Amino acid sequence: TFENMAGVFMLVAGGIVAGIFLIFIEIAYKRHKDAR
Amino acid sequence: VMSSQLDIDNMAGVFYMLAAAMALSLITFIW
Amino acid sequence: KKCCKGFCIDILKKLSRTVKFTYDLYLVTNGKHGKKVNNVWNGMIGEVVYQRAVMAVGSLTINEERSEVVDFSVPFVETGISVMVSRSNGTVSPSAFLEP
Amino acid sequence: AIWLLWGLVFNNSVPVQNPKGTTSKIMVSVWAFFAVIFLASYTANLAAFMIQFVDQVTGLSDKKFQRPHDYSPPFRFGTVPNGSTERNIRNNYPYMHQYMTKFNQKGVEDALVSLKTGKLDAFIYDAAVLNYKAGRDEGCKLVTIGSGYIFATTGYGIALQKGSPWKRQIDLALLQFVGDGEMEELETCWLTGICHNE
Amino acid sequence: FSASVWVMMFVMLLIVSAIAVFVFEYFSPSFTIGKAIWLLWGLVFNNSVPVQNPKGTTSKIMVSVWAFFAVIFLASYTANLAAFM
Amino acid sequence: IVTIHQEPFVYVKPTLSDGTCKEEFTVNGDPVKKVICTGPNDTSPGSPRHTVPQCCYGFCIDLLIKLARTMNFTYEVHLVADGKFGTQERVNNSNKKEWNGMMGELLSGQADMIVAPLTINNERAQYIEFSKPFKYQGLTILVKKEIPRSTLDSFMQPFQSTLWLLVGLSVHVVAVMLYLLDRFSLTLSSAMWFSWGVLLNSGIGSFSARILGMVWAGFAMIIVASYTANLAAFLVLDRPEERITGINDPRLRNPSDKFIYATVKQSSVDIYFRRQVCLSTMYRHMEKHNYESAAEAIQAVRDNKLHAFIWDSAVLEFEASQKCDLVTTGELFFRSGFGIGMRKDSPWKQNVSLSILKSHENGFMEDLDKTWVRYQEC
Amino acid sequence: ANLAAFLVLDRPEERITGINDPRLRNPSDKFIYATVKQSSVDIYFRRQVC
Numbered sequence A: 001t002f003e004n005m006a007g008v009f010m011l012v013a014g015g016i017v018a019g020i021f022l023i024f025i026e027i028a029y030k031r032h033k034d035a036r
Numbered sequence B: 001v002m003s004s005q006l007d008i009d010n011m012a013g014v015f016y017m018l019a020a021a022m023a024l025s026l027i028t029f030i031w
Numbered sequence C: 001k002k003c004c005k006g007f008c009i010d011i012l013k014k015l016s017r018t019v020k021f022t023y024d025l026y027l028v029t030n031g032k033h034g035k036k037v038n039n040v041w042n043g044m045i046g047e048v049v050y051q052r053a054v055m056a057v058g059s060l061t062i063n064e065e066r067s068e069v070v071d072f073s074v075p076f077v078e079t080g081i082s083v084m085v086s087r088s089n090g091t092v093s094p095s096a097f098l099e100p
Numbered sequence D: 001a002i003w004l005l006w007g008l009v010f011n012n013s014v015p016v017q018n019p020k021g022t023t024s025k026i027m028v029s030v031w032a033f034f035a036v037i038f039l040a041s042y043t044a045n046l047a048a049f050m051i052q053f054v055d056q057v058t059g060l061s062d063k064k065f066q067r068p069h070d071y072s073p074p075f076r077f078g079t080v081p082n083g084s085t086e087r088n089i090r091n092n093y094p095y096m097h098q099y100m101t102k103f104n105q106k107g108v109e110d111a112l113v114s115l116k117t118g119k120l121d122a123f124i125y126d127a128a129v130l131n132y133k134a135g136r137d138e139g140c141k142l143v144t145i146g147s148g149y150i151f152a153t154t155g156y157g158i159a160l161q162k163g164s165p166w167k168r169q170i171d172l173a174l175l176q177f178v179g180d181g182e183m184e185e186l187e188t189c190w191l192t193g194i195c196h197n198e
Numbered sequence E: 001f002s003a004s005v006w007v008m009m010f011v012m013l014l015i016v017s018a019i020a021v022f023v024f025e026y027f028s029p030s031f032t033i034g035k036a037i038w039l040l041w042g043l044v045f046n047n048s049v050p051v052q053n054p055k056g057t058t059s060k061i062m063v064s065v066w067a068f069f070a071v072i073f074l075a076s077y078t079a080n081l082a083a084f085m
Numbered sequence F: 001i002v003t004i005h006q007e008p009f010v011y012v013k014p015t016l017s018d019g020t021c022k023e024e025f026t027v028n029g030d031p032v033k034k035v036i037c038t039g040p041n042d043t044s045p046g047s048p049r050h051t052v053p054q055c056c057y058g059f060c061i062d063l064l065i066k067l068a069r070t071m072n073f074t075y076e077v078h079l080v081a082d083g084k085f086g087t088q089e090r091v092n093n094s095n096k097k098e099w100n101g102m103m104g105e106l107l108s109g110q111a112d113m114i115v116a117p118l119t120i121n122n123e124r125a126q127y128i129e130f131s132k133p134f135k136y137q138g139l140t141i142l143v144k145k146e147i148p149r150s151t152l153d154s155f156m157q158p159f160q161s162t163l164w165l166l167v168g169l170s171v172h173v174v175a176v177m178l179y180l181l182d183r184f185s186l187t188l189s190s191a192m193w194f195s196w197g198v199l200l201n202s203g204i205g206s207f208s209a210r211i212l213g214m215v216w217a218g219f220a221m222i223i224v225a226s227y228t229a230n231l232a233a234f235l236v237l238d239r240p241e242e243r244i245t246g247i248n249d250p251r252l253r254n255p256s257d258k259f260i261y262a263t264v265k266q267s268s269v270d271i272y273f274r275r276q277v278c279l280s281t282m283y284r285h286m287e288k289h290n291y292e293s294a295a296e297a298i299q300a301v302r303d304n305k306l307h308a309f310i311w312d313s314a315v316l317e318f319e320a321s322q323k324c325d326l327v328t329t330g331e332l333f334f335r336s337g338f339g340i341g342m343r344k345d346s347p348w349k350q351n352v353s354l355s356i357l358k359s360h361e362n363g364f365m366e367d368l369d370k371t372w373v374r375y376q377e378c
Numbered sequence G: 001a002n003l004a005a006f007l008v009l010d011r012p013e014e015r016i017t018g019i020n021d022p023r024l025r026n027p028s029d030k031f032i033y034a035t036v037k038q039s040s041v042d043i044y045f046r047r048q049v050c
C-alpha cells in the first residue's frame, strides 16, 4: 500500500540477506573447525 | 454500520482465478 | 463608562421584563469579595452593608457569613468543591485469553 | 492420537506426520475444519473485544486521598492558598491539610499547565471555574468527576437587602425562567467547551 | 482490500522467491528447481499440507525464519481485510 | 410534619407487637434512629384505611432530629393520606384552584413544617415558601440493561449458501484436472485426499502439477481470509440497542407502542414536561401509562413491563446502586433541587436556613450521603 | 488482535459536523479559518452575538 509494508519488507529482506551471508560464512568456519 | 457478506465481486474473483488456472493448464498441455 | 456584557448581565436583562426599572452597575476597587476584618465588610458585601447597593449580583459565592448579613434568592448556577482528574486511556486490563 | 489431535486444533504445528492412516484417518482429518473455524472465531472475538476506568475517587472521603502510602506513585493534589478551599478542608480534614500544604500553586493557569504536563494527579477548585476550564481545555483530557459527588455543593444566587420588597418577585421570576427552559440557549454558547468525550 | 498501488508487492514477492531459490542453489556445497519454489510457496502461508523439508541439515534451518515475515504479512493482510469492510 | 413515602429517603415499615420497631446498626455500628410514624395501613385507595402507627426511617430523619435538637422542636411525623405531592386539580365547580395531597394538607393548616423530597416549582413557591435545598440534582431516564449475548446465528454463510457447493465443485474439478495432468505427465482417491488435506492440514501427500499446486495454494487462503473478515465484521456490532442519550433522543420524540414510557402522576415532573409545549404528541402517550406510585412503577420496569421510567435521578441512581439490574441513561436535564414546605407567616425561615447551611458546611450532608445514599456500585 | 485494534481507526481527523462543531467554537492558531470581507457572511456571523 504505502511506506509501511514496503519498509517492513525492506527491513526483513535486509535482515534475511545479512543472515544468510553470515550463516554461510559461519557454517564454513564451523565445518573447518570440526574438520581441523 | 454495515456487515454484508461475499458479494458478486467475490464470484468475479473466483471466476478470474479459475480462468487463469484453466489457461495455465491448457498452456502446459499444449507445451 | 464601559460596555457591560455577560451571563449575569443577560440574567438582569431577562429580569428587566418583570422589574421594568433602570439599573446602573457599579464596581468595587477595594478587593474582590471581602470578609469580616475588624468588623468591617469590603467588596460587594461592604457595598450592600452601607446601603450603597440595593440589589447585588456578582456571582458571589454563598458562605456561612453572608446569610446573616444579607439575604439571597434561589441559586441558578451550580458550584462547590469539585475535583479534576486527567482522563485515562483505555487498556486491556481484563485478563486476556480468559473469560473476557 | 493425542499428538495429532493437539496438532490439528491449530495449524501452527511443525511436528505433524500422519502417514499411518490409510483411509480411516483421512475422514478423521475433517475435524480440522471445525478446528480452523474455532480458531478464526476466537481470533476475531479477541480482536473485536478490545475496543474500549474514568473516575474512581467518587468523593473526598475515599481512602485514596487520605492514604497516599498505599500506592507507589505519590498523590499530588492542588488548591489555591488564601481562599475558601483551605477553610473548607480545615474544618473537615485536619489531617489531609498537612499533606496538602506540600503542593501549592499561585494561579489557575499554573494548575492547567501542570495538568497538561501531568505534574499533578488531580486539582481542586470551584466547581463552575473547574468545569469551564475543563470544557475550554485543548485535547479534552481534563474533566470533573460525574455529578452529585461535590463535597460542599452550593450556588451563587443574587444578593439583596434585608427586608427589601424585591425577593418575593425575584425568586418567582428566577423559578419561572428556570422552569420555562430559558437557560439552555445561554448554556449552549456561554459555558460549553466540548461537553462530549469518550 | 490491500496493496493499493498493486504494482510493487506482486513483483516483490516474485523477486524474493527468485532470490531465495538462487541462494538455495548456492547452498549446494534437495533439488533446486523442484523443491525451493514449493517450499517458498508453502511457507508464505501455513495452510500447506505438502511440506517436507528434511534435506536441509543446518543451512535451510535459518532460511526457515522467513516464515516469521510470512505469518506477519498474513496477519496484517487478514486484519486489513477485516477492518476495511 | 407530613412526609411522603420515598424508598431512598423514607423506609416505611410495619411495627412489631410491642408497639415499637427492632433496633439495628449500620455498617459503622452506629445506632440507627427510628421514630414512630402515623399513617394509613393500606396505601392503595378503596380499602378499609386505618391510621395504625408505623415506624419510618431513612435519610431525612437524621436531619429532622438534628433540627429538632438545635431548634427546640418536637416533631410528629405523619404520612400522606393520598400518597401524592399534590398540585392543581379540576373538580365540581372547576373554577376553584385548590391543592390536594401534601400541598393541600399543608395549606389546610393541619401541617406546619414538611421535611420530604419536593422539587422546587414556581407554582408551589407562589403559595408556599421554600428554604434552601438539601442538595442539587436533576432527573434522568432508567432503562433495563441485560447481559449482552452473541446474536450471530449465521453459522454458515449469511446468504447464498451455494458457496459451499461451488467450493466443493472447485475441489472436484481441480482433482480431476490433476488426474488428467498426471495422465499427461494418482489412480483412485489420492488427488482428492490431497485436495482435502491442503485445506484441512493433516499431512496428506510434472510442471503442470506444480502450477496446479501453486494456484490451489493461492486459492486456499482466500476462503479463510473471507471467513475471518466476515466474522470480524459481524462481531464489530453492539448487540443491544443504543442507550438513551437524553431528552433530545430521536426515538423518544416519536412515541410508539413498542417502546412505552410514562411518568407517574401530576407531580413536578408532569408540570416540567407540560411547561415546554412543543411536544404535543408526548402527552398523547404519556398519560396512557401513568401508575400510582414510584414503587409500583419500578416494579413494573423490573418486570419487563415499562421500557423506561422518568423520575428524580437521586432515586434512580440509588436503585441502580442497590440492585445491579437497572441502569440510568442520559447525562442530565431540567436540574432542580429539593426544599422545605413552610407557610409565608412561619417565623422559622431564617433559623432553618442557617441551620441547614451550617450542617451542610460541617460535613453532615456528606456523612449522611455516605451512610444512606452512597453504597457499593456494580 | 493488536493489528486489528490499530487498523480500526480513522487516520484523518473527524470532519466538520457543522456550525456547532466544538473545535470551531474555540479558535486556535493550529486551525485557522476566516471569512473574506464584510459581505453577507460577515453580517450573518455578526448578527448572532454569542
Ligand SMILES: O=C(O)[C@H]1CN(CCCP(=O)(O)O)CCN1
Binding pocket: C033, C059, C060, C061, C062, D079, D080, D081, D082, D083, D084, D085, D086, D124, D125, D126
Ligand atoms: O463568589 C465568589 O466570591 C468567588 C469565591 N471564590 C473562592 C475561591 C477559593 P480558591 O482560590 O479555590 O481557594 C470562588 C469563585 N467565587
Ligand SMILES: *[C@@H]1O[C@H](CO)[C@@H](O)[C@H](O)[C@H]1NC(C)=O
Binding pocket: D080, D081, D082, D105, D106
Ligand atoms: C497567601 O498569603 C500569604 C501571606 O501570609 C503569602 O505569603 C502567600 O504567598 C499567599 N499565597 C499565594 C499563593 O499567593
Ligand SMILES: *[C@@H]1O[C@H](CO)[C@@H](O)[C@H](O)[C@H]1NC(C)=O
Binding pocket: F072
Ligand atoms: C428552648 O431552648 C432553651 C435553650 O436556649 C432551653 O433552655 C429550653 O428548655 C427550651 N424549651 C423547650 C420547651 O424545650
Ligand SMILES: *[C@@H]1O[C@H](CO)[C@@H](O)[C@H](O)[C@H]1NC(C)=O
Binding pocket: F347, F348, F351
Ligand atoms: C429562632 O427564631 C426565633 C424567632 O422565633 C429567634 O428569636 C431566634 O433568635 C432564632 N434563633 C437563632 C439562633 O437566631
